[PDB]
Amino acid sequence: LLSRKIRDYGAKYRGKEIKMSTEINSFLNLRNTIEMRIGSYTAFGVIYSISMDSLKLIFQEDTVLPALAKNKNLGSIQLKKNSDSKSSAAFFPFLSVKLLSASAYSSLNKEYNLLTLEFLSPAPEEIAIKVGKLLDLKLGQNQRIHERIIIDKDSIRKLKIDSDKAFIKFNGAKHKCLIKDLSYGGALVISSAIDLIFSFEFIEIFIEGKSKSLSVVFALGIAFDEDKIPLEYTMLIHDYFN
Ligand SMILES: Nc1nc2c(ncn2[C@@H]2O[C@@H]3COP(=O)(O)O[C@H]4[C@@H](O)[C@H](n5cnc6c(=O)[nH]c(N)nc65)O[C@@H]4COP(=O)(O)O[C@H]3[C@H]2O)c(=O)[nH]1
Ligand SMILES: Nc1nc2c(ncn2[C@@H]2O[C@@H]3COP(=O)(O)O[C@H]4[C@@H](O)[C@H](n5cnc6c(=O)[nH]c(N)nc65)O[C@@H]4COP(=O)(O)O[C@H]3[C@H]2O)c(=O)[nH]1
Ligand SMILES: [Cl-]
């Protein structure tokens, strides 16, 4: 019944995911740090996204990925509940996984792998049913699923960007703007539907998007083109939550 609903969501949402943020971890009661075991080898990584029967994990390069290859691309992971507890009660049993895919990328002169891992036995049903509900909301595009990061003294310190200064380009002209908020999928900027390019100085990152709201200086809401978002931007937002 619950099992059946989870099987239906598995089929419906094959290939889809929910990116992690503070509010998602809170809802799911799932810590974002996770231990992988490959025989007696062990390493901690961070969850990037979760799906109905798989999840994506970030590790440093030259750690888990070669270790998995030596073990026929099988390992086990331990999900923990969203607390600092060291009690047995905070942990789910280790679950068997198999590596489906991996990519390589850079951050701050350090190299990382993003690993897609499939559960070889049922994920905890309490988590699976909530991931399916989040995927229903993502499909609908009727309400927000993630928090937006408001740009202020505290968040600018945590984000790996230097300031609130950015640029908006549209109709062959580039204007200054101030970033007011950021999220995985867009931004609100202030300055003085249309296609545009949002950019800011970084290690200039350019993101193509479309206007969604304007209101009066002018506050402009932007939806980044969903299939084109630079991995470096996505990881900047993920880093903020981690
Ligand atoms: N198309 C589009 N327009 C957007 C989007 N984000 C903001 N806006 C526009 O900007 C207005 C201000 O949004 P806010 O200051 O975040 O203030 C919002 C926010 O606090 C809240 N709100 C509305 N929808 C949601 C939602 O799905 N989730 C959450 N958490 N808050 C929401 O209600 C307030 C007023 O909402 P509105 O009267 O609708 O007024 C919204 C709406 O016209 C977006 O993703 N898409
Ligand atoms: N940081 C930031 N991102 C922005 C802003 N405006 C749009 N976006 C981004 O653009 C995505 C798609 O906007 P939508 O197509 O209007 O699709 C929106 C819209 O239909 C609705 N929605 C969300 N918030 C509001 C709101 O305040 N008011 C209204 N009327 N609808 C909202 O829910 C859908 C999904 O919202 P999200 O998952 O947040 O996904 C939003 C968000 O990632 C902005 O002011 N700041
Ligand atoms: Cl997502």
SS (H, E, C) 225-241: CCCCCCHHHHHHHHHHH
Q: Which residues contact 20 (CB under 8 A, 6 or more apart)?
A: 32, 47, 48, 49, 50, 238, 241, 242
**Distance between CA atoms of residues 92 and 234, nearest Å:** 29
Half-sphere exposure of 68 (CA within 13 A, CB side): 24
Dihedrals phi, psi of 107, to nearest 5 degrees:
-150, 115
Give the H or E element holding residue 194.
Answer: none
Q: Which of 193, 194, 203 is closest to 233 using CA atoms?
A: 203
Method: X-ray
Q: 212 CB less than 6 Å from ligand 1?
A: yes
Q: Which two tokens stand for residue 145?
A: 């699923």
**Distance between CA atoms of residues 92 and 23, nearest Å:** 20
Dihedrals phi, psi of 136, to nearest 5 degrees:
-60, -45
Instruction: Report helix, strand and coil shares of the chain as percent, to nearest 5.
Output: 25, 40, 35
In DSSP terms, which residues pair with 238 in a beta bridge? Answer: none
Residues in the chain: 242
**Distance between CA atoms of residues 163 and 67, nearest Å:** 40
Give the H or E element holding residue 13.
Answer: none
What resolution in angstroms, rounded to 1 decimal?
A: 1.6
Q: 23 CB less than 6 Å from ligand 1?
A: no
- Counting ligands in written order, which one lies closest to the CA of residue 186? 2
- Going by CA atoms, what residue is nearest to atom 24 of ligand 1? 143
Q: Which two tokens stand for residue 18?
A: 């929910």
Query: Where do we find the tokens 């945590």?
Result: 158
Dihedrals phi, psi of 7, to nearest 5 degrees:
-65, -40
**Distance between CA atoms of residues 212 and 54, nearest Å:** 33
Q: 144 CB less than 6 Å from ligand 1?
A: yes
**Three-class SS state of 18:** strand
Q: Evaluate whether 2-140 and 149-241 have a shared fold.
A: yes
In DSSP terms, which residues pair with 19 in a beta bridge? Answer: 49
Q: 143 CB less than 6 Å from ligand 1?
A: yes
**Distance between CA atoms of residues 106 and 63, nearest Å:** 15
> Domain 2-140: which topology?
Thrombin, subunit H (2.40.10)
- Going by CA atoms, what residue is nearest to atom 4 of ligand 1? 213
**Distance between CA atoms of residues 200 and 121, nearest Å:** 44
User: In the CATH scheme, what is the code of domain 149-241?
Assistant: 2.40.10.220
Tell me the residue type at 149.
Answer: I
The atom number, within ligand 2, closest to the CA of 145 reads 38
Tell me the residue type at 221.
Answer: G
Domain limits of the chain?
2-140, 149-241
Tell me the residue type at 111.
Answer: E
